[PDB]
Ligand binder design. Structure first.
Ligand code: DHE
Ligand code: DHE
Ligand code: HEC
Ligand code: HEC
Lengths: 538, 539
């Protein structure tokens, strides 16, 4: 009966369902050799399913159309639009480039999914809530503590701000991307690019891990609920693969909900198989999380008032959403759609897109830099990877409606390859790095502007040279203030077999203050001051 | 080059864990395509396009290669007592074809095309602009008593006059229209074919005519209109089987506005499902929302249309295999069937939460259900089943009958399994139940009728197809439907395409034959929707 009920023909026409191949035959060792190169060298931009970069996707319909020789030449010489040259540079051999061309003509191999069973299997409560201290069992000045990422070591070091000494090094997931604080200021949350999250109790005799869990195969962001009456309630994390985000117990990390970001794009409104989750930021206006979904250019407002029945408001922005942060008032999310060269303004109160501001080539603000301009009122700034400009955008609809969501002015730095711009309420300086600048000297130093005289050109602080480290690229990255706002820290991100350091500068004088060296300080990248991260002070 | 080095590091994904699919038995183009044709003609309905639609293990290469050729040929040949038919023992397919199917399912599932906004707009057509349409009714038809009947294989629908029992107009639509729905103004009739083609019909024109059309997917089943106060003819939503999505369009022109993906995590295992088909869709009267049923993931979505630019969706978890359903007497609780889970999920449309999960019989199939006041239990909603001959009566009054609310308060027994629709009306003391897919010809060609005033008495069997006087063919009777005044119930005698069919009208007051609708154009009549009863949810 039920077999006759569901027994008619599918409305889908067999003639339009296509079998995939006609690709160059390659053995198992040849396919694995190419596959290994693809995730080590290509995937980052192009993605798992090869639809992550601008331009045409590397799926068999397009690649077989181009042909073996077209592909080999394209991989060999690259393009001026963001596709590196692998043959000319001499990175890959002609035998490898040949394998790569044949490889992308085959259906993309499939990485495993990662749901609730996998999540729970990896979930570990190391110290039960009840077995945790009721008070701070140490003498540490937690607010002024710095959570520094020792990238290649798969660890993080807690550095005491005033003493400049490493208080504790902790094993974490590989290459931790960011550190975030719980609203109470007690727990420290870190997540590795391997999607493994680690919750750390700063009140323990020695700050230690109390729980851990893996939320995907690849990830970048984590965050805690910051709405009033929700301290340490929920923790969210966004993954690159699978395309999803997960919500967990903010006290134990127990997985509760998992949502897929696979969907329709904002621009063409077509289906995208891999919309990776970028930045995530907690709302202060409503009990919701603001999630950035890259490839589809959507900003989702995930309400956690009722975790059992999840309500999500999908706001369209612009393609390629990445990093971003609050305006001075903590109401408007200033996030960059890098490859679209725009900054999306999300109103967290009224819950809508306030504007799409045209900025420079490939905006990369991190969380951005907020400061009051002598003429244009309160602005939010961002530097770029594509060029040497710095965009100042008005963020005061109330008192400065004429300058709101407008690129009010522009500043010029040392050049492109910039990654982070920084300032502080108590500071009158504006720092900007240039980490990926092709020039060694430029990439090994930072620019500083005088907020009291913006017409004047920037000064150049020789960070890497001050560290006195010897050989290596010595790339300087991310300025970060201490709780007081009179010290600015920088990482001298050198190789793993080289010597790296953390340089500190007296903000009041712009003079070298201290240098943090230690054999354990391996490949330091992101630094997050506890109080400043927790209270979004930027 | 700065941004190129920025995004230059390795992916956190281990190449060794990214797998290449193969190790399937070789098969040429001729072979592969032949198996594929059989797959979508015979297997897809249950198993889905990507082969994860049925209960039990999926037919994906990881599992199929594990079982192997032999195991697979054997299972396909004899089937299983759990819903998998026998294709060899019944002589449906040959051993040659079965060997092909066993080889086919060991390969990666061929991919059907996606259907986005560009494809949708391309298909979109405004046949008659809102400005060019009538300002009032230009015909003298009794629109509320009109029946929109589906002439399935014909790729058409027929509007039949309730009182005169005649076909007023025959309209070309998408292939095999599955359901008909009325807009909140009672002016526009909407129909959607299994091919995802929707047709909007203006009942006010001199002769009812199509004003707009669109194709929202490759395969579909449902369409629905906004019914919240102040949104008459504002929006139209349609759900698809492939791709896994629904589409919100302009209610006056059918212009595509938003397309949302239903691919996601399941309610039970909370794992990823690549093909969560959209089933029933009902419009809320409590909030400006559309209640959408997502089958495989067992999710009921409340899509708020108060602002379609920034879509807000509340995802309520219910139970796997959500299919059909309808409102309770008060129009607040959405009583929906999770057929393969043998349960009925109750969705409070006001408080927007899962009110309960009621345990019922084997494979519930309520259609929109049947509501009536039980002498002992108060207001109840009822459903019949495909898996058995039972009829579940569930209490739907938590306010004044909490002792019974959301409980399978009582049961009734019909002719047997294979039931598709149960039905009644506020003005009627009778309760009909068909048996369309019952393996017995006599039972499948008749309908059971209960007495609401004496629920202890056994039903009377009405010989609907025999009354028709049609001759040869299966002559399956399906879906009872009352008229505007609820004094006559209509049935469909769904006979073959090359055979003779009819609509049989029965006097509700006397349970006697009242009329028989026959017409050469009345080919494979299936669903029938009375304009008034459909539009105002009278059931
Ligand atoms: C989505 C995302 C965020 C926002 C998180 C948030 O706010 O919740 C972010 C922030 C960050 C932040 C946060 C700083 C802040 O002030 O908020 C830091 C320090 C950082 C160190 C790096 N990032 Fe980041 N980053 C990516 C992704 C992201 N980076 C990439 O996918 C990319 C382009 C390529 C990659 O190799 O991962 C990339 C490269 C880098 C680097 O090269 C850095 C310097 C070193 C590393 O570990 O790869 N990213
Ligand atoms: C999701 C869904 C609904 C609810 C929509 C709503 O109300 O929003 C529905 C309702 C319906 C309704 C609604 C009646 C009502 O009173 O609301 C009718 C008449 C109907 C005629 C048929 N349906 Fe239906 N039906 C399916 C799906 C559905 N059918 C299938 O997938 C299935 C099992 C397989 C198929 O072949 O499509 C199926 C078979 C059938 C039939 O065999 C029928 C009799 C004829 C046909 O064309 O296939 N279905
Ligand atoms: C980002 C830093 C990239 C890396 C690493 C690699 N590719 Fe790329 N690729 C990138 C972009 C932005 C584009 C578009 C370029 C344009 O001018 O349109 C491309 C393009 C290709 C193509 C050509 C696609 C086509 O037009 O048919 C191919 C074949 C290609 N890329 C291959 C590829 C391989 C094999 C790589 C790793 C060894 C690789 N790309 C890395 C960005 C990035
Ligand atoms: C629904 C009316 C079905 C149709 C039409 C077909 N199949 Fe099916 N199949 C269905 C169910 C409910 C199940 C579960 C059976 C069980 O006892 O668990 C199955 C199972 C299969 C399997 C076996 C899967 C396994 O355990 O490894 C196979 C190989 C299979 N079905 C094949 C198949 C083919 C090729 C069909 C069309 C020619 C087909 N099925 C139709 C439901 C239904």
């Amino acid at each position: 009966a039920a077999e006759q009920y569901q027994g008619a023909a599918s409305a889908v026409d067999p003639a339009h369902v296509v079998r995939t191949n006609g690709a160059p035959d390659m053995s198992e060792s040849e396919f694995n050799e190419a596959k290994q190169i693809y995730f080590q060298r290509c995937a980052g931009c192009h993605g798992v399913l090869r639809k992550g970069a601008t331009g045409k996707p590397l799926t068999p319909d397009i690649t077989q159309q181009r042909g073996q020789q077209y592909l080999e030449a394209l991989i060999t010489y690259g393009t001026p639009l963001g596709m590196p040259n692998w043959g000319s540079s001499g990175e890959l051999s002609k035998e490898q480039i040949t394998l790569m061309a044949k490889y992308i003509q085959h259906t993309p191999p499939q990485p495993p999914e990662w749901g609730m069973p996998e999540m729970r299997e990896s979930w570990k409560v190391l110290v039960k809530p009840e077995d945790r201290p009721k008070k701070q069992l140490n003498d540490l000045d937690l607010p002024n503590l710095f959570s520094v990422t020792l990238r290649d070591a798969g660890q993080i070091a807690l550095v005491d701000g005033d003493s400049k000494k490493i208080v504790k090094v902790i094993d974490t997931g590989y290459a931790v991307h960011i550190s975030r604080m719980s609203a109470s200021g007690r727990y420290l949350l870190v997540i590795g690019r391997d999607a493994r999250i680690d919750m750390i109790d700063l009140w323990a005799k020695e700050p230690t891990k109390v729980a851990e869990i893996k939320i995907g195969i690849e990830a970048r962001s984590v965050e805690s609920s910051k709405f009033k009456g929700y301290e340490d309630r929920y923790t969210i994390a966004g993954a690159y693969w699978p395309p999803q985000f997960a919500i967990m117990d903010g006290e134990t990390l127990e997985p509760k909900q998992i949502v897929s970001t696979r969907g329709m794009t904002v621009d063409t409104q077509t289906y995208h198989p891999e919309p990776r989750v970028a930045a995530i930021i907690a709302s202060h206006e409503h009990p919701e999380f603001i999630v950035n979904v890259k490839e589809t250019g959507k900003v989702l407002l995930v309400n956690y008032k009722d975790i059992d029945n999840l309500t999500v408001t999908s706001i369209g922005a612009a393609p390629f959403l990445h990093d971003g942060g609050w305006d001075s008032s903590h109401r408007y999310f200033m996030t960059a759609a890098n490859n679209s060269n725009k900054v999306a303004v999300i109103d967290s109160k009224d819950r809508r897109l306030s504007a799409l501001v045209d900025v420079g080539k490939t905006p990369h603000p991190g969380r951005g830099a907020n400061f009051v301009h002598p003429k244009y009122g309160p602005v939010w700034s961002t530097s770029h990877l594509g060029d040497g400009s710095i965009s100042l955008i008005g963020t005061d609809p109330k008192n400065h409606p004429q300058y709101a969501w407008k690129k009010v002015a522009e500043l010029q730095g040392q050049g492109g390859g910039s990654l982070f711009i920084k300032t502080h309420p108590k500071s009158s300086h504006l720092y900007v790095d240039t980490t990926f600048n092709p020039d060694a000297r430029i990439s090994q130093s930072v620019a500083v502007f005088d907020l009291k005289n913006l017409d004047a050109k920037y000064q150049v602080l020789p960070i890497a040279e001050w560290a006195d480290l010897g050989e290596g690229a010595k790339r300087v990255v991310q300025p970060e203030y201490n709780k007081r706002g009179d010290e600015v820290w920088f990482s001298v991100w050198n190789g793993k077999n080289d010597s790296s350091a953390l340089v500190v500068v007296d903000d009041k004088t712009l003079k070298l203050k201290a240098v943090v060296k230690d054999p354990r300080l391996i490949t330091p990248t992101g630094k997050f001051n506890v109080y400043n991260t927790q209270h979004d002070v930027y």
